[PDB]
Every structure is written in C-alpha cells, then in structure tokens.
Design a protein around this nucleic acid. Sequence first.
RNA 1: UUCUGGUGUCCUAGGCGUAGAGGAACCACACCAAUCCAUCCCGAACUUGGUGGUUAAACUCUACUGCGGUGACGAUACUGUAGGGGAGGUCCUGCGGAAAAAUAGCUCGACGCCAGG
RNA 2: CAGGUAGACAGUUUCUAUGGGGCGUAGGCCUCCCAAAAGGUAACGGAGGCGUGCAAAGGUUUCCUCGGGCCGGACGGAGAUUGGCCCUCGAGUGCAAAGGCAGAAGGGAGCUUGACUGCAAGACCCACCCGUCGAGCAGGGACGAAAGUCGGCCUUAGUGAUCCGACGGUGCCGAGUGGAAGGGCCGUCGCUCAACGGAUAAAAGUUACUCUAGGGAUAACAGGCUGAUCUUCCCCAAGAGUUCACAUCGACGGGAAGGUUUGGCACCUCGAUGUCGGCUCUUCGCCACCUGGGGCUGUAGUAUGUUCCAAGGGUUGGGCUG
RNA 3: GUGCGGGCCGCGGUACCAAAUCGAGGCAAACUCUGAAUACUAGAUAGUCAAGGUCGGCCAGUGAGACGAUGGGGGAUAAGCUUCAUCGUCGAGAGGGAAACAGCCCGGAUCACCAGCUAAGGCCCCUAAAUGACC
Lengths: 122, 86, 135, 65
Amino acid sequence: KAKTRREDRTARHVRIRKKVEGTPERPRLCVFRSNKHLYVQVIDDSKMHTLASASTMQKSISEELDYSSSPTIEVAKKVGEVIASACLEKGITKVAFDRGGYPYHGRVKALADAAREKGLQF
Amino acid sequence: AHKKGAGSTKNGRDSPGQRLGVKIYGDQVAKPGAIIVRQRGTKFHAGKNVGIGKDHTIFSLIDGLVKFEKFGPDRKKISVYPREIV
Amino acid sequence: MLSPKRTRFRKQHRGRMKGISYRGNRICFGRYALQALEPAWITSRQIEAGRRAMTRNARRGGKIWVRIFPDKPVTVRPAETRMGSGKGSPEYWVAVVKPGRILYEISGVAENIARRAVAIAASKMPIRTQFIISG
Amino acid sequence: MAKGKDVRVKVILECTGCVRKSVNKGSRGVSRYITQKNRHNTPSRLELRKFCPYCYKHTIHGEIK
RNA sequence: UUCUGGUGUCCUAGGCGUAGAGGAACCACACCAAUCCAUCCCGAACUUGGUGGUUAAACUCUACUGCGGUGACGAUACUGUAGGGGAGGUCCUGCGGAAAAAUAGCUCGACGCCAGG
RNA sequence: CAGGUAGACAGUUUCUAUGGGGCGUAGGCCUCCCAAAAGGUAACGGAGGCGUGCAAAGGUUUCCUCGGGCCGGACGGAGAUUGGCCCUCGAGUGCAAAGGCAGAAGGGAGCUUGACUGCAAGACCCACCCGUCGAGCAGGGACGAAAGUCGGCCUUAGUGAUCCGACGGUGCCGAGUGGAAGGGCCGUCGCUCAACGGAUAAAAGUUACUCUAGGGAUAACAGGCUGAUCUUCCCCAAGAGUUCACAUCGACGGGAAGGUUUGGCACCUCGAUGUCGGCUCUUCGCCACCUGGGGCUGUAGUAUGUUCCAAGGGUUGGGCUG
RNA sequence: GUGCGGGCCGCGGUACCAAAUCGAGGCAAACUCUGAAUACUAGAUAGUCAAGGUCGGCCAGUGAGACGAUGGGGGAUAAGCUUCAUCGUCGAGAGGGAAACAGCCCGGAUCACCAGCUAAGGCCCCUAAAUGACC
C-alpha cells in the first residue's frame, strides 16, 4: 500500500559515533556473538581488510575440548586471546572498543579484556 | 516605551549566508560556507545532508570549520596529493 | 476565471501575470471549449455574469464546469494619497487568465446550441477569446 | 519578587568557596566571577557547586546560606 | 564455483507488496533461569547457563514487471549576448545553452575484505 | 545659616522620521518573502515575536523512539487506561519563525553540575566600535570498561558603550620618610540613558504682534504629466415597454473617447505669478437648448420622444445670499 | 465516484448542502519531492592591455541626482511620479540622426586642411543623396 521507512536495528543501537571518525575509519573490534558461538574480528579501516580473525570453533583446533561449551564466559576470553597476539605480530596493536548491544558485562567484557593481556592498552 | 497598534513588521536582516572557498582549493583552517553560525568543527571541507554523493577537496590545512546541519559534519579525511616531502 | 470560495485568512500581495508558460490546458470536460489570448485581472462580477449567460440561452439542459479559480487579491486606493497598502476587498478579487488555458466547457447538447452559448459568454469576458472544438 | 512593570530586580547572587576567596566578589550588591542568577521566588535557597577558583583547583563554592 | 555470518565502498536501475523455497555445516525461533545484569509492570526486549524441537515467523535467496523509482530522441518553456516590433502590458528574430512534465525503453542492483560448510 | 512659598522677574528646553506640515503611527535586536539561484542591497511594502525562562529542559553514559486511524474490551455512547494491526520529517523541539534533527539536541533515568581558569594557529561579520566560530596547548575534575564528550541552554533575539561611584583582592604606586587616604590593576554591581552608536544629574506650549536667515529639492491658487473617480459615446444582452428585445428605455458585465469634476504627481515659480464672485468687453470648439434641412417613431393632425448634419446667428429682467 | 455524521417525513430512500480517500484538470513572494541561462568563488594555459590589481602616506570632492532598457516591490503592471538591484547615457565630452526634445540611437571632439571612405539616419523639392532594377 504505502512504503514506510523504518530505521534498522544497527541504526539505533548507537553504532557509529563521532570523534573516532578523526580517521577515515576507526579500528573497531567486531565482537558479536551468535545464537551458539561467538565471532571476533579486528577489522582494519580505510577500505577493508583485517589484521586477524578468530572464532570459537577455530580455537578447538589449537587446543580445546571437542564437545566443549562455547557460550560460557570462559571461552570468551579464549576467543579474545586467540585473535590477539598474532594480530600484534601482523604489525602493531590497532584495535579499539566498539560494541552496541552488550550491557557492559556482556559476553564481550572478556573479549575486550583479553586485548589488554596481549598489549592493547587504553 | 513599547509601542502597540495598527502596524506590520519591520527591521531588515542579514546573517549573512554565503560560501567561503570551494571544492578543489587550498581550503585553510578557516570556515567554508557557514550559512549559519554555531557551526561545529570539521577537519575537512564537507559533503553530506543533500543529494547522494560526497564532496572532496584537493588540499587541506589542519582541521577546518563547516556548518553542522548542511554540509558536514565530520567523517572521512580527504586531501588529494599527500602533503609530504619526497 | 472565478468560482464560489470559502472564508479564510486571504490577504496577500498582488502578483504579476507572467509569460504564457503556465497556462496551456486543453479540452477535457465538455465537447467544445473557450480559451484566452492575454492575461488579466478577471473579477467575480465577470465570471458570474458570464456563467449565468452561458445557460441563460439554454435553461434546463446540460451542466457547466469550471476548471479555473481566482487567487491574486485586489487592493484599491480610496481617494487619499498613499500611506500604506490597499485593503484587498473594496471592489473584489481576481487572478490570471493567461492564453493556452481552457475556460468554459459545454456538452450534452448540439453543436449550434453549444456554439451561440459560448458567444455571449465571450462578450462578458474583458479579454479576447478564442473558440475551439476538440482533437 | 512579583514580576511585572513596577519594581523588579535581577535575582543575581554569588558562590564563594569555603573558607577561601578569589573567582568571586564580596560586597553589598555584587556578583561572583561566574555571575550566578537564582530564582528567589521559586523553591531555591542554599546554592552550591564545586568550582575551580584561583588558589589550587576545584573546591566547594556557594555562598549566601 | 554454490551457500552462510559480521563489517564497508555505493544509499528507493538497489523500495514495497505478493508467491515459492532453504539450513540444527552456519544464522534465527526456541529450552532453562537460585545467580553477574535487566524489566519505574512482565528476563517480551537485554542478559546468563544450555537437552530437545523447529527454521512457521524473522532473516537470507528465487519467481512474479500491481504500487514507487531510474530515464532517452524530438518538441516546448525559460534565458545570456547582439537587434528588431509592440494595445493587454508581453512577445518575435539571429545565435549559445536548453531542464520539469510526459512517451518508448531500462529495471525488481551490482561488488570488495575476512571466517565457517 | 536654613525649611516652605516664590515664572511677579531672569536664563532655556520642549526631537526626528514623515512622497507639505500636522494628527496617528513609526523611530534596537530576532524569522520568512520582496534581494532578479554566491553575499550585500530601499520604501509607516506583506504575515508574527523578544527585553526571558531554567540547581536544571546543563554535561556525560546507557536505554527508549512518535501523530493519527482501524478492529476489540467493565466503568466506552466523537477523544481517556490496555492489547494487536496500518504505524511513512504529515510528531515532538521552553516561547515567533526559517532551516535542521529519529548516527537524534526528541524522551526517560543514574551519576553529576566545563552554565572550567589561563591562552589560543587560522577565519567570518562591520566605515569604525562591536559581534560570531574555533582544533589544539597549560593547570585541575565529571561520566563510561574504554575510545571519548562537556568552556551553558538545536541555532538565530532575550540587549546598550562613556563618565561619575560602592565594595573585595592585589605591599603596583602612593609627590620629606615610614603608613594611610586616593589612584592603578584583577573581578562584579547601578542608568524601559528606547528619541536605546544613549547631547543634560534636571526642561512642557502659544505666538492672527511677529521678526531674521533660505528654499519650491518642503504645502496653499494655477499651468503641466498623469487621470482609477467624474462626463460622453459604444458592444453583447435577460427583461420593462399588452403582445414584440433595441419607437423609448434597458439589469449582470465589457471596450474607448474626451477631459471642465474628485485626487496623485507637487516636474517649472515662496529675490512672490494677488483668491472667489459681480461688473465691463469678448474669442474659440463641441456630444446646439431655440430657428433650418432629414431618418425611425407603440409619429393620425396640432404638439412631442430619439438620432444624424449643421452653431450663420441669437441666447432675459428681478426677490434673497458675498 | 465512494463515503462517519448531520438537515426535511423518518426506516427502505434522497439534490455532493457538506469532512478524509481514489482518478482527472489548475493557482501561490512567504508552496515547490525535482530543476536552466546566468552571476559569483577557485585552480592552470595562449595572447592582449605603455602594472591597470593590491598596501601605506599627503591633499580632495561628494552623500536631496535624473533618464532609457531589463528583472521585481508601491499605484489601476496610471505618471519624464516614488522606492531598490543591474547596464549605459546625461549629469563632469560636442557633433551626426529622431523637424525642433540634454537623459533614446550612431559615434564618443589635441589642432589646421575648397582630402577620401563610412556608422546611425536617408536619397522628388525645400538642406547634400536612388520618381534605381525585379515581384
């Protein structure tokens, strides 16, 4: 009948912020959790490309229990550390804090903290 | 004192509302456009709040000053021909 | 080029009849029609004296349609000097009748009866009128 | 006081720091450096705001009890 | 190459409506909830621990040209410059530029980085 | 010495803008349009507001995001609380208005309160004064995990210098020295000083007794331009005229001529051109009332109505009033 | 056309007397989802113009200008009327032409010269110049 415009979710959770835009794009940290696992990514800027991308499953390859729980907070810090380290070896710590939907202590509280264990400090 | 009675409005106005500099130019850290005061800060020219398509300048000069509503605010940095030696 | 309106905060500037650009309608309602050649300030006492005359020679027949409407007010100076702007309702109100636009429309009748009907209606109009048909 | 064309007065007070001075004036009818304006009539009384005066930085401020 | 998730370059040829269809490898519902935390009322939404079932809805695709939108050629309006007419108060001519509406037609996007089958 | 009375006397003020003056109105700032697509740009030209509000509608963090309508429900019979659907600047923004805004300044809550001091590259806006914006730096804080924000309130008005003075701070100075008074510097307050870039701490009128310096760029009589109104003529035309539209007249409207009316303009004259009327004596033109020559006639005749050509000529004596 | 309600008998019904909405046809300085010329700002280049453009200093003058074309407010889009913007002229430059009219048009005067060619406007006579040719 009549076309209606509705601002999408990722357009009201206060995703994009000002200041950080001092650079064409701020080094955000994709710390989103699915409905079973959690995926982390240190997406770069400018146009695209990233430094290092890790997941809950990928960790299982290095050294982790097979049928081990993932949603557990214990895995959070594990997913935040696996993505780290190598990310720094790629050049230099270029990750910031970006997350809209997790009430501070969200399943990302350990993801951001894990970065403070490899070198990233703010 | 304050007057009242049969009469229309009065007193003229002038902001003014023009545009300083323009695309492709050594836009110094002054204030391009600025149709309205209270314009926030912007480390570049402008290019938003209008038809599709972003504007860009060939040369910049440490931050700038453009309107808050029209043309702006701040996002990506633009500066053709890197201002560097060698 | 006027029709019964309704009360409102009507009281603005005069205006200015520009090029034929705007006006340029055609023949939609009614078989034949009638257009103008030059813009002007048509008052209400002209359209009414022309509409009733359009059916005055008919009486109980087809239907009359008006694809026009006045807007531009009309302020006139009483007799004194010029201290301010006019009222806007001393005599009446008008609009702009630029050429190319359609005015009166007649249908549901013969060609002759619909021909003489527009004749008298054209006499009531201060500006010259052009008679057309269709196509 | 009752507002209107008769006898009005700008309700402008001050805010002197606790046992201190500077960034504020003290007289019969004078205002501080920040020149604060209360409402008087509207439920107010007892004003205070930690401000940074001359000596050191940040204190208490807020005179006229 | 196909499919899926997050984030961009482009923002209604990329929108909406309708119909069909797919996955418990991925994503959504969903199960549980004495807790960290949230709900000025309900864990509906956030959030936390996780069998089963589902993937209806939502979302991601496909098909279908109702509703939007994109958009020629020609003509017309207007206009700079240089002139000529003129009773509606405008208009014409040489020359340059020349859209809006409308018509044929296009069209129900196309891609970039990374990760998981 | 001093409190009243005290223009009887003396010294002055009593604005301007204003297509004459005067009366009225209007004489800052803020919004839109006229400014004819960069700004700027007139006129008592077209519509509305301000001389503030606010311990917070301030900042920050997180979160929440309409109007209206339809279908339903105890207290509903058009709107009120609830649930679902359509939910699209067509809501809400402290107050006028334009623009802008749902990455929200919108709305709610906690913590707080930069409604920060000292400076500030580079620029806008004005003749000047003045006004506005502003990254970053130095000394200290608030909020969030953090990045990070805030130097007032979505923005634009909510205002006004100088001088005289009150008071605090500052051992700056302080005329013999040491102090002090005073002054200087830092900070703040007093003036519908609006006729508000505000001449005074404090000031209204007449002048037909008028005077002087100037001009019609500023009026009155009049000429001129122009001329809606006025006068005359003409077009279409329902009707009146018994019937029949136009012998006569003719509603609702329209197009012109002429130009003596009422006005505007106030272009040439206030180193001036004496106003009206009457009287004396005329000149010209015309849509000439009478005389003459004609058409129509709801014109029988005698007399009239209307229209066309034509003015050659002629065209009154008194009561009352200037 | 559809259609809450509401007028006249009063529930079948009824001329749009009349709100939203769908289709069709218009008006607006303060409407305008779209959208010229042109003006203006800025970066290079070829020439042209005997630095014209800019800063500082000494002496000025002038602030009631008028008119025509063009784009708009006032007046009836009435005035060589009035009030703004822009260009040109007069005003601080004649002359040629419009009979005679400074402001309209052409062209814009160091000077002499019984020296020619042109612009605007014209070519029967009066003041020079075609009663020239063809339709």
